[PDB]
Design a protein around this ligand. Structure first.
Ligand SMILES: [Ca+2]
Length: 558
């Protein structure tokens, strides 16, 4: 481990042999120790290796390759680390090792050898203006296979080869941490390549991402009756269906109905199952005056329109076809759909289905943004690129009897369906568990991108196929937490420490310490709570400060 060993990986006559012959290294530079800053932990002396694998040309004429960045510390804990992606990937991160949970420390700051990838395409090169911008990679079938599983496999094999070459020995254990799309990766790793990583953290995982566009079309068509006004193309303004004050009224009614169902009134719905059975906005009341939430006469700032409650109920039910078959899943009611801290309302929930209120056009993720564009180009087979101005209308005429079949369809050179290369719904985790693999999953209740109930349903099927699943896999649902972060909940936590303590040392996480990044939702300076493994919830012990984990334990729901 030295500077010369770092630069000898930059091709030359050196004996660094890559598993894939098509691996090309651009950068191999020795980096000095960066002292800690106010927002990041100290990074040690490390070797940075940057390169690309499988440089080719797609069937669309665009150049494709699988980029990687690798940082290897001089003082190394013998452990390997890969961080997951986000969105449709296409960008190469700093490769310091984000562990999620709003953490100051990075994996590299903890002396891990860190690797990262771009997914098999670049957002600067593969930006076709006739194929909905940065999702244009979906026009080439191999770029889909790289975004699905191939790129992460290839980068993992190259990273371990370089680690073994630079350190003279193989990594002891390998760990992966990803949120959203990176959470889908982590589950895909445990299923397609169980031998690669010993510990895996998958947060808010989109293990059914090709289905999010179907829910997005259902969302749009359910809320359109409540929409007020048209945009430049005559599409209803979904963002105008609910004001930010309206959403706060809804989250307040959920709080008035389900907050005490866990045994404590604290602005947190810890008994999510009891809320689904108890809450119905058509019958619930506004806790601020005891009157009913659904308006009896004309709309006021103290009531929701009957057309509004109907719309949100249909959206939360989940998409179905005329045959009644559920196309995705239903969503959970939770207080994290809104939230007012200081001046700002919570946008972490409405930004997916509705969009920003003060906008004369649609800007919801599922109406015209990246999510709807991604389904049209990357998840549907054959892909249907189009002008951006027509994506909103495409989600308005979405036929739930013809269009949902495109995520299982195959056509021409697109030899694999999107649910085949992107899906991660398998419960075949025996090979992963039996070699010592441990997996931690977390998901917020107020996640509008992916349903936490759907993650729980997968966790139930895993426990059915493999008795004793809690010995290698636990699910930690987070109340109030939005997608990956934000909302009135404890969204900050260190998940790399328990993951290491589980894989090695064999200590199962009976709970996970967590605190709130914005405690002002509850009007306090700080709030710390334990995250409990499914299906346990946090139970108040009966005395002490309600903003300290020491007064809370993990118990079965009351
Ligand atoms: Ca509570």
């Amino acid at each position: 481990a030295s500077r010369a060993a770092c630069e000898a990986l930059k091709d030359g006559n050196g004996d660094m042999v890559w598993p894939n012959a098509a691996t090309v290294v651009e950068v191999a530079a020795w980096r000095d120790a960066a002292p800690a800053t106010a927002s990041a932990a100290a990074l040690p002396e490390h070797c940075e290796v940057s390169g690309a694998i499988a440089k080719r040309t797609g069937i669309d004429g665009y150049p494709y390759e699988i980029k990687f960045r690798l940082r290897m510390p001089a003082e190394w804990n013998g452990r390997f680390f890969m961080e997951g992606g986000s969105g449709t990937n296409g960008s190469l991160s700093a490769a310091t090792g984000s562990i999620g949970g709003g953490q100051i420390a990075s994996a590299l700051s903890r002396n891990f050898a860190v690797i990262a990838t771009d997914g098999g395409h670049d957002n600067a090169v593969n930006d076709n203006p006739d194929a909905l911008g940065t999702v244009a990679f979906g026009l080439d079938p191999q770029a889909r296979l790289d975004y699905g599983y191939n790129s992460y496999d290839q980068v993992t094999q190259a990273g371990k080869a370089a680690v073994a070459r630079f350190y003279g020995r193989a990594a002891d254990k390998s760990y992966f941490i990803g949120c959203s799309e990176g959470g889908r990766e982590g589950m895909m790793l445990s299923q397609r390549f169980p031998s690669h990583y010993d510990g895996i953290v998958a947060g808010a995982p989109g293990f059914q991402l090709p289905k999010a566009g179907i829910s997005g079309a259902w969302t749009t068509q359910s809320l359109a009756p409540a929409a007020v006004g048209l945009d430049a193309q005559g599409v209803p303004l979904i963002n105008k269906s609910f004001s930010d004050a309206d959403l706060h009224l809804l989250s307040q009614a959920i709080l008035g109905t389900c907050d005490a169902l866990d045994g404590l009134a604290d602005g947190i719905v810890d008994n999510y199952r009891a809320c689904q059975a108890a809450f119905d906005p058509a019958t619930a009341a506004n806790p601020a005056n005891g009157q009913a939430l659904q308006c009896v006469g004309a709309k006021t700032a103290d009531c929701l329109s009957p057309v509004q409650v109907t719309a949100i109920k249909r959206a939360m039910a989940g998409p179905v076809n005329s045959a009644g078959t559920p196309l995705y899943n239903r969503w959970a009611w939770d207080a994290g759909m809104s939230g007012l801290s200081g001046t700002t309302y919570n946008q972490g929930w409405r930004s997916w289905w509705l969009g920003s209120f003060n906008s004369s056009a649609n800007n919801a993720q599922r109406v015209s943004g990246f999510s709807a564009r991604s389904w049209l180009v990357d998840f549907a087979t054959p892909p249907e690129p189009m002008p951006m101005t027509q994506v909103a209308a495409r989600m308005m005429k979405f036929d739930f009897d013809i269009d949902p079949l495109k995520i299982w369809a195959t056509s021409g050179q697109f030899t694999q369906s999107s649910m085949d290369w992107h899906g991660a719904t398998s419960t075949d985790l025996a090979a992963f568990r039996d070699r010592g693999g441990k997996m931690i999953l977390y998901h917020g209740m107020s996640d509008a991108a992916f349903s936490a109930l759907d993650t729980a349903d997968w966790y139930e099927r895993l426990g059915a196929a493999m008795p004793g699943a809690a010995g290698f896999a636990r699910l930690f649902l987070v109340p109030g937490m939005n997608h990956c972060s934000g909302g009135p909940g404890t969204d900050r936590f260190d998940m790399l420490t328990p993951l290491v303590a589980w894989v090695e040392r064999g200590e199962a996480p009976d709970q996970i310490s967590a605190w709130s990044g914005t405690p002002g939702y509850f009007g306090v300076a700080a709030r710390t709570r334990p995250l409990c493994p499914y299906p346990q919830i946090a139970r108040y012990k009966g005395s002490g400060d309600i903003n300290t984990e020491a007064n809370f334990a993990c118990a079965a729901p009351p």
